[PDB]
């Protein structure tokens, strides 16, 4: 149907906008602390602590499969990156501190992404 095509064009355009959002958020992590999944070989207890691991590469795979239906879904995954790090790692660590800075800086980007998603539809 033409209705299904129109819906798919909308998902494709959201995907474009979320790709640019993702690139902007990832630039706020120049250390690349959040680029890749936590290694279970290097942190074998990780899953005892963290139930839903998340990282930018995993978000990128979901994105390219057009697997985010709305901005809320994307934000949930970004929040997991931050929140997982802040639980596993202590306040005095470079990892925790990197997550705070990512969250603070990411806030700016996400605020305008929500306006653009509402504004464009």
UniProtKB/Swiss-Prot annotation:
Q: Name its cellular compartments.
A: Nucleus; Chromosome
Residues in Bromo domain copies = 9-113
Organism's domain of life? Eukaryota
Q: Which Cys-Cys disulfides exist here?
A: none
Q: Where does the chain cross the membrane?
A: none
Give the position of the cross-link Glycyl lysine isopeptide (Lys-Gly) (interchain with G-Cter in SUMO2): 41
How would you summarize where this protein is expressed among tissues? Highly expressed in testis.
- Described function: Scaffold subunit of various histone acetyltransferase (HAT) complexes, such as the MOZ/MORF and HBO1 complexes, that acts as a regulator of hematopoiesis. Plays a key role in HBO1 complex by directing KAT7/HBO1 specificity towards histone H3 'Lys-14' acetylation (H3K14ac), thereby promoting erythroid differentiation.
Its quaternary organisation is: Component of some HBO1 complex composed of KAT7/HBO1, MEAF6, ING4 and BRD1/BRPF2. Component of the MOZ/MORF complex composed at least of ING5, KAT6A, KAT6B, MEAF6 and one of BRPF1, BRD1/BRPF2 and BRPF3. Interacts (via PHD-type zinc finger domain) with unmodified histone H3. Interacts (via PWWP domain) with dimethylated and trimethylated 'Lys-79' on histone H3.
From the Swiss-Prot or TrEMBL record, give the protein name. Bromodomain-containing protein 1
Species for this entry: Homo sapiens
